[PDB]
Amino acid sequence: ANARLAKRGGRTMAITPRHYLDFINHYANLFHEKRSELEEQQMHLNVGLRKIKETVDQVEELRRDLRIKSQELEVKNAAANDKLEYAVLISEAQAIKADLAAVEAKVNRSTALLKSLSAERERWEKTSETFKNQMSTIAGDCLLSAAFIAYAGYFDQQMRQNLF
Amino acid sequence: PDLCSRVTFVNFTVTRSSLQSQCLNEVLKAERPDVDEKRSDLLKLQGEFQLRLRQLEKSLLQALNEVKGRILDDDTIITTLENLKREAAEVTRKVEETDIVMQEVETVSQQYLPLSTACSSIYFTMESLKQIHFLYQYSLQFFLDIYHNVLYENPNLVTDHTQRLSIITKDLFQVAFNRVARGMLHQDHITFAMLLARIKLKGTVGEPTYDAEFQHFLRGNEIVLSAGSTPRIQGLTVEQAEAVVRLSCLPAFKDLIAKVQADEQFGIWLDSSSPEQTVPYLWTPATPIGQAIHRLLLIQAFRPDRLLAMAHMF
């Protein structure tokens, strides 16, 4: 490219092996920092997805407890109707129904939380799947970027684009 | 090379896109100040909202990273839900600002895109102008001073945008030619006028971009000529014959030899006298500018002496 510019008749600067050493050092530093960044991002995404899985498991456990103790309230109400001591049974049924209200409110709130966080999950899983492809291109991307950042600093936009 | 080895070069040149954006912003400020200031405010608000969205993504990642427990049994996750809801609402509110930005940018584009294209073309012509005589070299501050003259010194200072844009454009072309040719030799004034004419011709719609005949008019001597081709010597010499053969490759000039042989009575409008005022033949309809281009090609083929006068009248 320098020879072509000289044949064209413009003004050029002679290149030196210092530029090659600078380019290779930039390649090494960029490769290391990009590898660290993607590794930290994947670690954070894995933590987030594992915690979402744990939250879904807790939601399922809450649903199972809700239906089991709903059946328990139904059985207790049937027993109280058969036995129709009574005041204590009524108080126990009222306490169980208040627990049902609290548990159902928590279940609905957790379901709303899951619905709201599904929009983040549907992209987080896609990024985690795309990580395998995006980690295999880091060498070529860093080579291109280091070559541009250490070599194409003197020319104009057209010659920068031509070299790239 | 001793200094070149030790340092890396960072060249801050000027690009067409940057110059077009800068000129568009300047003409917006000097033409529609309210639109310009509200566009700047909307861009700033969009940038800070995108920054807020990225901060929210980072905060959600950190909150889901560093609580170490069950999400369903905590109140920090409840605050997280509240934040997700409220800032999903502001993401929803982003759309109306985006629509207003789209309306503003489409109005600005449809009103002042050819002006900014002319801005870039004229400045790049002025920069490439140094290849001729290497004495005059102009900077970007010269162009910015030209714009401070154009946008702030208006005859009949109209208050109508449709006429004002055309007035600004033609005043720009005239004062650019004046301020450049004031410090530039008379031998190249016709060259700069031709370049400005090419810029305005490309800008103006109606004339179909006369690239092929302009390329032939500029590079007709360097093209390969026919070998052994001997046209008629009834009223033209060997140089005129060679020029006619070279020009005959254009789609407009098909029956040139037949036409000049049939028009024997018109032996004066194409040879001798002053052919600039009256030219034979023609350019299907043709624009006056296209007819001028065709007559200029005819002048270059037949009487190359009158090229400067014909360029002046073109």
PDB file of all heavy atoms in Angstrom, chain A residues 13-14 16 18-19 44 47 51 54-55 58 106 109 116 120 124 153-154 160, chain B residues 4-5 9-11 57 61 64-65 67-72 77-78 81 85, unseen atoms left out:
ATOM      1  N   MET A  13       4.671   7.683   4.841  1.00  0.00           N
ATOM      2  CA  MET A  13       5.619   7.493   5.929  1.00  0.00           C
ATOM      3  C   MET A  13       6.133   6.063   5.881  1.00  0.00           C
ATOM      4  O   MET A  13       5.341   5.120   5.785  1.00  0.00           O
ATOM      5  CB  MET A  13       4.971   7.776   7.287  1.00  0.00           C
ATOM      6  CG  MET A  13       4.240   9.101   7.358  1.00  0.00           C
ATOM      7  SD  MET A  13       5.354  10.490   7.621  1.00  0.00           S
ATOM      8  CE  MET A  13       4.266  11.862   7.256  1.00  0.00           C
ATOM      9  N   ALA A  14       7.452   5.907   5.940  1.00  0.00           N
ATOM     10  CA  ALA A  14       8.054   4.585   5.852  1.00  0.00           C
ATOM     11  C   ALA A  14       7.731   3.767   7.095  1.00  0.00           C
ATOM     12  O   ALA A  14       7.771   4.273   8.218  1.00  0.00           O
ATOM     13  CB  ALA A  14       9.567   4.699   5.678  1.00  0.00           C
ATOM     14  N   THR A  16       8.205   0.536   9.789  1.00  0.00           N
ATOM     15  CA  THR A  16       9.319  -0.015  10.541  1.00  0.00           C
ATOM     16  C   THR A  16       8.866  -1.268  11.272  1.00  0.00           C
ATOM     17  O   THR A  16       7.666  -1.468  11.486  1.00  0.00           O
ATOM     18  CB  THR A  16       9.859   1.008  11.554  1.00  0.00           C
ATOM     19  OG1 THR A  16       8.854   1.293  12.531  1.00  0.00           O
ATOM     20  CG2 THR A  16      10.268   2.301  10.862  1.00  0.00           C
ATOM     21  N   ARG A  18       9.101  -1.685  14.324  1.00  0.00           N
ATOM     22  CA  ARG A  18       8.436  -1.216  15.536  1.00  0.00           C
ATOM     23  C   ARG A  18       6.924  -1.286  15.390  1.00  0.00           C
ATOM     24  O   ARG A  18       6.215  -1.615  16.347  1.00  0.00           O
ATOM     25  CB  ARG A  18       8.871   0.212  15.856  1.00  0.00           C
ATOM     26  CG  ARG A  18      10.248   0.318  16.464  1.00  0.00           C
ATOM     27  CD  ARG A  18      10.231  -0.107  17.916  1.00  0.00           C
ATOM     28  NE  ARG A  18       9.524   0.846  18.761  1.00  0.00           N
ATOM     29  CZ  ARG A  18      10.094   1.893  19.342  1.00  0.00           C
ATOM     30  NH1 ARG A  18      11.375   2.168  19.167  1.00  0.00           N
ATOM     31  NH2 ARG A  18       9.358   2.685  20.116  1.00  0.00           N
ATOM     32  N   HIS A  19       6.413  -0.990  14.192  1.00  0.00           N
ATOM     33  CA  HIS A  19       4.982  -1.115  13.941  1.00  0.00           C
ATOM     34  C   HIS A  19       4.525  -2.563  14.047  1.00  0.00           C
ATOM     35  O   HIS A  19       3.444  -2.840  14.574  1.00  0.00           O
ATOM     36  CB  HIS A  19       4.639  -0.545  12.566  1.00  0.00           C
ATOM     37  CG  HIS A  19       4.746   0.945  12.487  1.00  0.00           C
ATOM     38  ND1 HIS A  19       3.672   1.781  12.700  1.00  0.00           N
ATOM     39  CD2 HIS A  19       5.800   1.749  12.209  1.00  0.00           C
ATOM     40  CE1 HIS A  19       4.060   3.036  12.561  1.00  0.00           C
ATOM     41  NE2 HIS A  19       5.346   3.045  12.264  1.00  0.00           N
ATOM     42  N   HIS A  44     -21.522 -14.591  34.680  1.00  0.00           N
ATOM     43  CA  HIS A  44     -22.694 -13.868  35.168  1.00  0.00           C
ATOM     44  C   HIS A  44     -23.989 -14.430  34.584  1.00  0.00           C
ATOM     45  O   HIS A  44     -24.990 -14.576  35.300  1.00  0.00           O
ATOM     46  CB  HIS A  44     -22.556 -12.382  34.841  1.00  0.00           C
ATOM     47  CG  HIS A  44     -21.629 -11.647  35.758  1.00  0.00           C
ATOM     48  ND1 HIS A  44     -20.405 -12.152  36.141  1.00  0.00           N
ATOM     49  CD2 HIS A  44     -21.745 -10.443  36.364  1.00  0.00           C
ATOM     50  CE1 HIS A  44     -19.809 -11.292  36.947  1.00  0.00           C
ATOM     51  NE2 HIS A  44     -20.601 -10.245  37.097  1.00  0.00           N
ATOM     52  N   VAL A  47     -24.824 -17.696  36.328  1.00  0.00           N
ATOM     53  CA  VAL A  47     -25.400 -17.457  37.652  1.00  0.00           C
ATOM     54  C   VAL A  47     -26.857 -17.029  37.531  1.00  0.00           C
ATOM     55  O   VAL A  47     -27.728 -17.513  38.271  1.00  0.00           O
ATOM     56  CB  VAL A  47     -24.576 -16.412  38.424  1.00  0.00           C
ATOM     57  CG1 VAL A  47     -25.279 -16.043  39.723  1.00  0.00           C
ATOM     58  CG2 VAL A  47     -23.195 -16.939  38.717  1.00  0.00           C
ATOM     59  N   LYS A  51     -30.076 -19.176  38.923  1.00  0.00           N
ATOM     60  CA  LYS A  51     -30.983 -18.603  39.912  1.00  0.00           C
ATOM     61  C   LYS A  51     -32.419 -18.573  39.398  1.00  0.00           C
ATOM     62  O   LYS A  51     -33.364 -18.765  40.172  1.00  0.00           O
ATOM     63  CB  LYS A  51     -30.507 -17.210  40.316  1.00  0.00           C
ATOM     64  CG  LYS A  51     -31.292 -16.600  41.460  1.00  0.00           C
ATOM     65  CD  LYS A  51     -30.714 -15.263  41.853  1.00  0.00           C
ATOM     66  CE  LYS A  51     -29.391 -15.443  42.567  1.00  0.00           C
ATOM     67  NZ  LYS A  51     -29.549 -16.093  43.896  1.00  0.00           N
ATOM     68  N   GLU A  54     -33.686 -22.054  39.893  1.00  0.00           N
ATOM     69  CA  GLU A  54     -34.022 -22.259  41.299  1.00  0.00           C
ATOM     70  C   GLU A  54     -35.338 -21.577  41.661  1.00  0.00           C
ATOM     71  O   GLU A  54     -36.142 -22.124  42.427  1.00  0.00           O
ATOM     72  CB  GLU A  54     -32.890 -21.746  42.190  1.00  0.00           C
ATOM     73  CG  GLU A  54     -32.989 -22.189  43.641  1.00  0.00           C
ATOM     74  CD  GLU A  54     -33.584 -21.123  44.540  1.00  0.00           C
ATOM     75  OE1 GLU A  54     -33.438 -19.924  44.220  1.00  0.00           O
ATOM     76  OE2 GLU A  54     -34.196 -21.481  45.567  1.00  0.00           O
ATOM     77  N   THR A  55     -35.574 -20.377  41.122  1.00  0.00           N
ATOM     78  CA  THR A  55     -36.833 -19.681  41.378  1.00  0.00           C
ATOM     79  C   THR A  55     -38.016 -20.437  40.781  1.00  0.00           C
ATOM     80  O   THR A  55     -39.086 -20.503  41.395  1.00  0.00           O
ATOM     81  CB  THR A  55     -36.770 -18.257  40.825  1.00  0.00           C
ATOM     82  OG1 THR A  55     -35.517 -17.660  41.180  1.00  0.00           O
ATOM     83  CG2 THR A  55     -37.902 -17.415  41.395  1.00  0.00           C
ATOM     84  N   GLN A  58     -38.729 -23.302  43.083  1.00  0.00           N
ATOM     85  CA  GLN A  58     -39.450 -22.833  44.263  1.00  0.00           C
ATOM     86  C   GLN A  58     -40.903 -22.501  43.939  1.00  0.00           C
ATOM     87  O   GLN A  58     -41.787 -22.728  44.772  1.00  0.00           O
ATOM     88  CB  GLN A  58     -38.747 -21.618  44.867  1.00  0.00           C
ATOM     89  CG  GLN A  58     -39.260 -21.232  46.249  1.00  0.00           C
ATOM     90  CD  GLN A  58     -38.169 -20.688  47.151  1.00  0.00           C
ATOM     91  OE1 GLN A  58     -37.188 -21.374  47.442  1.00  0.00           O
ATOM     92  NE2 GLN A  58     -38.338 -19.452  47.606  1.00  0.00           N
ATOM     93  N   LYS A 106     -48.628 -15.088  47.254  1.00  0.00           N
ATOM     94  CA  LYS A 106     -47.213 -15.282  46.950  1.00  0.00           C
ATOM     95  C   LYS A 106     -47.024 -16.021  45.629  1.00  0.00           C
ATOM     96  O   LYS A 106     -46.119 -15.693  44.853  1.00  0.00           O
ATOM     97  CB  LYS A 106     -46.529 -16.037  48.091  1.00  0.00           C
ATOM     98  CG  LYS A 106     -46.308 -15.203  49.341  1.00  0.00           C
ATOM     99  CD  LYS A 106     -45.521 -13.938  49.035  1.00  0.00           C
ATOM    100  CE  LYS A 106     -44.072 -14.254  48.695  1.00  0.00           C
ATOM    101  NZ  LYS A 106     -43.392 -15.001  49.789  1.00  0.00           N
ATOM    102  N   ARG A 109     -47.787 -13.593  42.791  1.00  0.00           N
ATOM    103  CA  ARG A 109     -46.701 -12.626  42.672  1.00  0.00           C
ATOM    104  C   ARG A 109     -45.466 -13.252  42.031  1.00  0.00           C
ATOM    105  O   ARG A 109     -44.819 -12.635  41.175  1.00  0.00           O
ATOM    106  CB  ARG A 109     -46.376 -12.054  44.051  1.00  0.00           C
ATOM    107  CG  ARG A 109     -44.982 -11.493  44.196  1.00  0.00           C
ATOM    108  CD  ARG A 109     -44.777 -10.927  45.593  1.00  0.00           C
ATOM    109  NE  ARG A 109     -45.509  -9.683  45.819  1.00  0.00           N
ATOM    110  CZ  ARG A 109     -45.227  -8.517  45.251  1.00  0.00           C
ATOM    111  NH1 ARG A 109     -44.208  -8.377  44.417  1.00  0.00           N
ATOM    112  NH2 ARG A 109     -45.982  -7.460  45.536  1.00  0.00           N
ATOM    113  N   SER A 116     -42.520 -11.538  33.987  1.00  0.00           N
ATOM    114  CA  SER A 116     -41.742 -10.339  33.701  1.00  0.00           C
ATOM    115  C   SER A 116     -40.298 -10.668  33.341  1.00  0.00           C
ATOM    116  O   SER A 116     -39.699  -9.983  32.504  1.00  0.00           O
ATOM    117  CB  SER A 116     -41.787  -9.388  34.896  1.00  0.00           C
ATOM    118  OG  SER A 116     -41.389 -10.046  36.084  1.00  0.00           O
ATOM    119  N   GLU A 120     -36.319 -11.290  29.696  1.00  0.00           N
ATOM    120  CA  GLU A 120     -34.866 -11.307  29.809  1.00  0.00           C
ATOM    121  C   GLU A 120     -34.306 -12.701  29.554  1.00  0.00           C
ATOM    122  O   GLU A 120     -33.229 -12.840  28.962  1.00  0.00           O
ATOM    123  CB  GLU A 120     -34.439 -10.805  31.189  1.00  0.00           C
ATOM    124  CG  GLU A 120     -34.788  -9.350  31.455  1.00  0.00           C
ATOM    125  CD  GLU A 120     -34.713  -8.490  30.207  1.00  0.00           C
ATOM    126  OE1 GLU A 120     -33.587  -8.188  29.759  1.00  0.00           O
ATOM    127  OE2 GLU A 120     -35.779  -8.115  29.675  1.00  0.00           O
ATOM    128  N   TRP A 124     -31.300 -14.082  27.176  1.00  0.00           N
ATOM    129  CA  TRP A 124     -30.138 -14.582  27.898  1.00  0.00           C
ATOM    130  C   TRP A 124     -29.753 -15.980  27.430  1.00  0.00           C
ATOM    131  O   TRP A 124     -28.566 -16.272  27.230  1.00  0.00           O
ATOM    132  CB  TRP A 124     -30.425 -14.566  29.399  1.00  0.00           C
ATOM    133  CG  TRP A 124     -30.197 -13.223  30.019  1.00  0.00           C
ATOM    134  CD1 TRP A 124     -29.928 -12.059  29.363  1.00  0.00           C
ATOM    135  CD2 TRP A 124     -30.202 -12.905  31.416  1.00  0.00           C
ATOM    136  NE1 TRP A 124     -29.772 -11.033  30.263  1.00  0.00           N
ATOM    137  CE2 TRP A 124     -29.934 -11.526  31.531  1.00  0.00           C
ATOM    138  CE3 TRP A 124     -30.409 -13.650  32.580  1.00  0.00           C
ATOM    139  CZ2 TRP A 124     -29.870 -10.878  32.762  1.00  0.00           C
ATOM    140  CZ3 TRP A 124     -30.344 -13.004  33.802  1.00  0.00           C
ATOM    141  CH2 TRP A 124     -30.077 -11.632  33.884  1.00  0.00           C
ATOM    142  N   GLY A 153      -3.377   4.016  11.036  1.00  0.00           N
ATOM    143  CA  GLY A 153      -3.567   5.261  11.746  1.00  0.00           C
ATOM    144  C   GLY A 153      -3.230   6.520  10.985  1.00  0.00           C
ATOM    145  O   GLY A 153      -3.651   7.603  11.401  1.00  0.00           O
ATOM    146  N   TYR A 154      -2.492   6.415   9.885  1.00  0.00           N
ATOM    147  CA  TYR A 154      -2.031   7.594   9.168  1.00  0.00           C
ATOM    148  C   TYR A 154      -2.886   7.939   7.958  1.00  0.00           C
ATOM    149  O   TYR A 154      -3.016   9.119   7.619  1.00  0.00           O
ATOM    150  CB  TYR A 154      -0.579   7.398   8.721  1.00  0.00           C
ATOM    151  CG  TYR A 154      -0.036   8.521   7.873  1.00  0.00           C
ATOM    152  CD1 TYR A 154       0.170   9.783   8.410  1.00  0.00           C
ATOM    153  CD2 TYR A 154       0.271   8.320   6.535  1.00  0.00           C
ATOM    154  CE1 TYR A 154       0.666  10.811   7.641  1.00  0.00           C
ATOM    155  CE2 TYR A 154       0.766   9.343   5.758  1.00  0.00           C
ATOM    156  CZ  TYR A 154       0.962  10.586   6.316  1.00  0.00           C
ATOM    157  OH  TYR A 154       1.456  11.612   5.547  1.00  0.00           O
ATOM    158  N   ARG A 160      -7.963   3.392   4.758  1.00  0.00           N
ATOM    159  CA  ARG A 160      -8.239   2.552   5.920  1.00  0.00           C
ATOM    160  C   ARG A 160      -9.204   1.431   5.564  1.00  0.00           C
ATOM    161  O   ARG A 160      -8.980   0.266   5.922  1.00  0.00           O
ATOM    162  CB  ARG A 160      -8.816   3.397   7.054  1.00  0.00           C
ATOM    163  CG  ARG A 160      -7.797   4.158   7.871  1.00  0.00           C
ATOM    164  CD  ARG A 160      -8.466   4.817   9.063  1.00  0.00           C
ATOM    165  NE  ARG A 160      -7.761   6.010   9.510  1.00  0.00           N
ATOM    166  CZ  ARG A 160      -7.902   6.553  10.710  1.00  0.00           C
ATOM    167  NH1 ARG A 160      -8.712   6.028  11.613  1.00  0.00           N
ATOM    168  NH2 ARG A 160      -7.215   7.650  11.013  1.00  0.00           N
TER     169      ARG A 160
ATOM    170  N   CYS B   4       9.466   8.467  12.706  1.00  0.00           N
ATOM    171  CA  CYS B   4       8.291   7.678  12.351  1.00  0.00           C
ATOM    172  C   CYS B   4       8.253   6.343  13.086  1.00  0.00           C
ATOM    173  O   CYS B   4       7.166   5.826  13.367  1.00  0.00           O
ATOM    174  CB  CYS B   4       8.256   7.452  10.840  1.00  0.00           C
ATOM    175  SG  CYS B   4       6.815   6.542  10.254  1.00  0.00           S
ATOM    176  N   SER B   5       9.416   5.769  13.396  1.00  0.00           N
ATOM    177  CA  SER B   5       9.441   4.491  14.101  1.00  0.00           C
ATOM    178  C   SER B   5       8.941   4.630  15.533  1.00  0.00           C
ATOM    179  O   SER B   5       8.205   3.768  16.025  1.00  0.00           O
ATOM    180  CB  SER B   5      10.855   3.914  14.089  1.00  0.00           C
ATOM    181  OG  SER B   5      11.614   4.418  15.173  1.00  0.00           O
ATOM    182  N   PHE B   9       0.909   7.296  14.242  1.00  0.00           N
ATOM    183  CA  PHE B   9       0.263   8.462  13.660  1.00  0.00           C
ATOM    184  C   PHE B   9      -1.243   8.377  13.851  1.00  0.00           C
ATOM    185  O   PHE B   9      -1.843   7.317  13.654  1.00  0.00           O
ATOM    186  CB  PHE B   9       0.607   8.582  12.178  1.00  0.00           C
ATOM    187  CG  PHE B   9       2.002   9.056  11.927  1.00  0.00           C
ATOM    188  CD1 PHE B   9       2.881   8.297  11.180  1.00  0.00           C
ATOM    189  CD2 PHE B   9       2.440  10.258  12.454  1.00  0.00           C
ATOM    190  CE1 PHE B   9       4.168   8.732  10.953  1.00  0.00           C
ATOM    191  CE2 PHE B   9       3.727  10.697  12.231  1.00  0.00           C
ATOM    192  CZ  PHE B   9       4.592   9.934  11.479  1.00  0.00           C
ATOM    193  N   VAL B  10      -1.844   9.492  14.248  1.00  0.00           N
ATOM    194  CA  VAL B  10      -3.288   9.614  14.390  1.00  0.00           C
ATOM    195  C   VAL B  10      -3.695  10.793  13.519  1.00  0.00           C
ATOM    196  O   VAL B  10      -3.510  11.953  13.904  1.00  0.00           O
ATOM    197  CB  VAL B  10      -3.716   9.823  15.846  1.00  0.00           C
ATOM    198  CG1 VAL B  10      -5.223   9.800  15.956  1.00  0.00           C
ATOM    199  CG2 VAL B  10      -3.098   8.772  16.746  1.00  0.00           C
ATOM    200  N   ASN B  11      -4.251  10.509  12.345  1.00  0.00           N
ATOM    201  CA  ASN B  11      -4.577  11.537  11.366  1.00  0.00           C
ATOM    202  C   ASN B  11      -6.045  11.923  11.500  1.00  0.00           C
ATOM    203  O   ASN B  11      -6.931  11.076  11.352  1.00  0.00           O
ATOM    204  CB  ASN B  11      -4.278  11.053   9.949  1.00  0.00           C
ATOM    205  CG  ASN B  11      -3.827  12.172   9.038  1.00  0.00           C
ATOM    206  OD1 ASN B  11      -3.727  13.323   9.456  1.00  0.00           O
ATOM    207  ND2 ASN B  11      -3.550  11.841   7.784  1.00  0.00           N
ATOM    208  N   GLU B  57     -29.661  -3.043  32.778  1.00  0.00           N
ATOM    209  CA  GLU B  57     -29.221  -4.402  32.467  1.00  0.00           C
ATOM    210  C   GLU B  57     -28.079  -4.832  33.383  1.00  0.00           C
ATOM    211  O   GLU B  57     -28.081  -5.953  33.912  1.00  0.00           O
ATOM    212  CB  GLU B  57     -28.804  -4.504  31.002  1.00  0.00           C
ATOM    213  CG  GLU B  57     -28.674  -5.932  30.497  1.00  0.00           C
ATOM    214  CD  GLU B  57     -29.993  -6.682  30.522  1.00  0.00           C
ATOM    215  OE1 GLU B  57     -31.033  -6.074  30.194  1.00  0.00           O
ATOM    216  OE2 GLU B  57     -29.988  -7.881  30.871  1.00  0.00           O
ATOM    217  N   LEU B  61     -28.215  -7.812  36.224  1.00  0.00           N
ATOM    218  CA  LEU B  61     -27.204  -8.865  36.265  1.00  0.00           C
ATOM    219  C   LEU B  61     -26.557  -8.951  37.644  1.00  0.00           C
ATOM    220  O   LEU B  61     -26.386 -10.045  38.197  1.00  0.00           O
ATOM    221  CB  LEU B  61     -26.153  -8.610  35.185  1.00  0.00           C
ATOM    222  CG  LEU B  61     -25.377  -9.812  34.652  1.00  0.00           C
ATOM    223  CD1 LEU B  61     -26.321 -10.786  33.965  1.00  0.00           C
ATOM    224  CD2 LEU B  61     -24.293  -9.347  33.692  1.00  0.00           C
ATOM    225  N   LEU B  64     -29.139 -10.348  40.237  1.00  0.00           N
ATOM    226  CA  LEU B  64     -29.288 -11.787  40.087  1.00  0.00           C
ATOM    227  C   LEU B  64     -27.979 -12.533  40.303  1.00  0.00           C
ATOM    228  O   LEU B  64     -27.980 -13.768  40.298  1.00  0.00           O
ATOM    229  CB  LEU B  64     -29.851 -12.106  38.701  1.00  0.00           C
ATOM    230  CG  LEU B  64     -31.372 -11.992  38.593  1.00  0.00           C
ATOM    231  CD1 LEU B  64     -31.879 -12.597  37.297  1.00  0.00           C
ATOM    232  CD2 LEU B  64     -32.038 -12.654  39.779  1.00  0.00           C
ATOM    233  N   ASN B  65     -26.869 -11.817  40.471  1.00  0.00           N
ATOM    234  CA  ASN B  65     -25.574 -12.443  40.698  1.00  0.00           C
ATOM    235  C   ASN B  65     -25.207 -12.551  42.173  1.00  0.00           C
ATOM    236  O   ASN B  65     -24.561 -13.527  42.569  1.00  0.00           O
ATOM    237  CB  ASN B  65     -24.489 -11.652  39.959  1.00  0.00           C
ATOM    238  CG  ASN B  65     -23.202 -12.439  39.775  1.00  0.00           C
ATOM    239  OD1 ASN B  65     -23.121 -13.620  40.110  1.00  0.00           O
ATOM    240  ND2 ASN B  65     -22.184 -11.776  39.243  1.00  0.00           N
ATOM    241  N   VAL B  67     -27.049 -12.222  45.413  1.00  0.00           N
ATOM    242  CA  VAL B  67     -27.939 -12.318  46.566  1.00  0.00           C
ATOM    243  C   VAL B  67     -27.771 -13.672  47.247  1.00  0.00           C
ATOM    244  O   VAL B  67     -27.957 -13.783  48.465  1.00  0.00           O
ATOM    245  CB  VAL B  67     -29.408 -12.056  46.183  1.00  0.00           C
ATOM    246  CG1 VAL B  67     -29.570 -10.631  45.667  1.00  0.00           C
ATOM    247  CG2 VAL B  67     -29.899 -13.059  45.164  1.00  0.00           C
ATOM    248  N   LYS B  68     -27.398 -14.692  46.471  1.00  0.00           N
ATOM    249  CA  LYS B  68     -27.051 -16.028  46.968  1.00  0.00           C
ATOM    250  C   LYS B  68     -28.164 -16.625  47.833  1.00  0.00           C
ATOM    251  O   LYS B  68     -27.997 -16.879  49.027  1.00  0.00           O
ATOM    252  CB  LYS B  68     -25.724 -15.992  47.731  1.00  0.00           C
ATOM    253  N   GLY B  69     -29.310 -16.852  47.207  1.00  0.00           N
ATOM    254  CA  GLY B  69     -30.433 -17.410  47.932  1.00  0.00           C
ATOM    255  C   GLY B  69     -31.623 -17.627  47.027  1.00  0.00           C
ATOM    256  O   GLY B  69     -31.495 -17.659  45.802  1.00  0.00           O
ATOM    257  N   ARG B  70     -32.787 -17.777  47.653  1.00  0.00           N
ATOM    258  CA  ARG B  70     -34.038 -17.981  46.935  1.00  0.00           C
ATOM    259  C   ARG B  70     -34.662 -16.635  46.588  1.00  0.00           C
ATOM    260  O   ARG B  70     -34.866 -15.792  47.469  1.00  0.00           O
ATOM    261  CB  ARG B  70     -35.008 -18.816  47.772  1.00  0.00           C
ATOM    262  N   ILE B  71     -34.956 -16.439  45.302  1.00  0.00           N
ATOM    263  CA  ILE B  71     -35.529 -15.175  44.847  1.00  0.00           C
ATOM    264  C   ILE B  71     -36.957 -15.013  45.352  1.00  0.00           C
ATOM    265  O   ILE B  71     -37.388 -13.905  45.690  1.00  0.00           O
ATOM    266  CB  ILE B  71     -35.458 -15.078  43.313  1.00  0.00           C
ATOM    267  N   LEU B  72     -37.714 -16.111  45.416  1.00  0.00           N
ATOM    268  CA  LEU B  72     -39.130 -16.037  45.758  1.00  0.00           C
ATOM    269  C   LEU B  72     -39.383 -15.689  47.221  1.00  0.00           C
ATOM    270  O   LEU B  72     -40.537 -15.431  47.580  1.00  0.00           O
ATOM    271  CB  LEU B  72     -39.817 -17.360  45.419  1.00  0.00           C
ATOM    272  N   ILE B  77     -35.928  -8.817  45.636  1.00  0.00           N
ATOM    273  CA  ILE B  77     -36.495  -9.270  44.371  1.00  0.00           C
ATOM    274  C   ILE B  77     -37.815  -8.561  44.083  1.00  0.00           C
ATOM    275  O   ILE B  77     -38.173  -8.350  42.918  1.00  0.00           O
ATOM    276  CB  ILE B  77     -36.653 -10.800  44.392  1.00  0.00           C
ATOM    277  CG1 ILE B  77     -35.434 -11.441  45.062  1.00  0.00           C
ATOM    278  CG2 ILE B  77     -36.823 -11.339  42.985  1.00  0.00           C
ATOM    279  CD1 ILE B  77     -34.150 -11.316  44.266  1.00  0.00           C
ATOM    280  N   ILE B  78     -38.554  -8.170  45.124  1.00  0.00           N
ATOM    281  CA  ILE B  78     -39.772  -7.389  44.920  1.00  0.00           C
ATOM    282  C   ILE B  78     -39.434  -6.003  44.381  1.00  0.00           C
ATOM    283  O   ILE B  78     -40.089  -5.499  43.455  1.00  0.00           O
ATOM    284  CB  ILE B  78     -40.580  -7.307  46.227  1.00  0.00           C
ATOM    285  CG1 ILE B  78     -40.815  -8.707  46.805  1.00  0.00           C
ATOM    286  CG2 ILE B  78     -41.891  -6.569  46.006  1.00  0.00           C
ATOM    287  CD1 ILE B  78     -41.377  -9.704  45.815  1.00  0.00           C
ATOM    288  N   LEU B  81     -38.628  -6.463  40.787  1.00  0.00           N
ATOM    289  CA  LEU B  81     -39.845  -6.517  39.981  1.00  0.00           C
ATOM    290  C   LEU B  81     -40.405  -5.122  39.735  1.00  0.00           C
ATOM    291  O   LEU B  81     -40.821  -4.799  38.613  1.00  0.00           O
ATOM    292  CB  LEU B  81     -40.883  -7.401  40.677  1.00  0.00           C
ATOM    293  CG  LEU B  81     -42.272  -7.611  40.068  1.00  0.00           C
ATOM    294  CD1 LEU B  81     -42.720  -9.043  40.271  1.00  0.00           C
ATOM    295  CD2 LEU B  81     -43.292  -6.668  40.689  1.00  0.00           C
ATOM    296  N   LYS B  85     -40.806  -3.309  36.095  1.00  0.00           N
ATOM    297  CA  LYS B  85     -42.071  -2.778  35.593  1.00  0.00           C
ATOM    298  C   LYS B  85     -41.956  -1.304  35.207  1.00  0.00           C
ATOM    299  O   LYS B  85     -42.352  -0.910  34.101  1.00  0.00           O
ATOM    300  CB  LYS B  85     -43.163  -2.979  36.641  1.00  0.00           C
ATOM    301  CG  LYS B  85     -43.592  -4.435  36.826  1.00  0.00           C
ATOM    302  CD  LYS B  85     -43.924  -5.104  35.499  1.00  0.00           C
ATOM    303  CE  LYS B  85     -44.150  -6.603  35.654  1.00  0.00           C
ATOM    304  NZ  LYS B  85     -44.473  -7.264  34.356  1.00  0.00           N
TER     305      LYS B  85
END
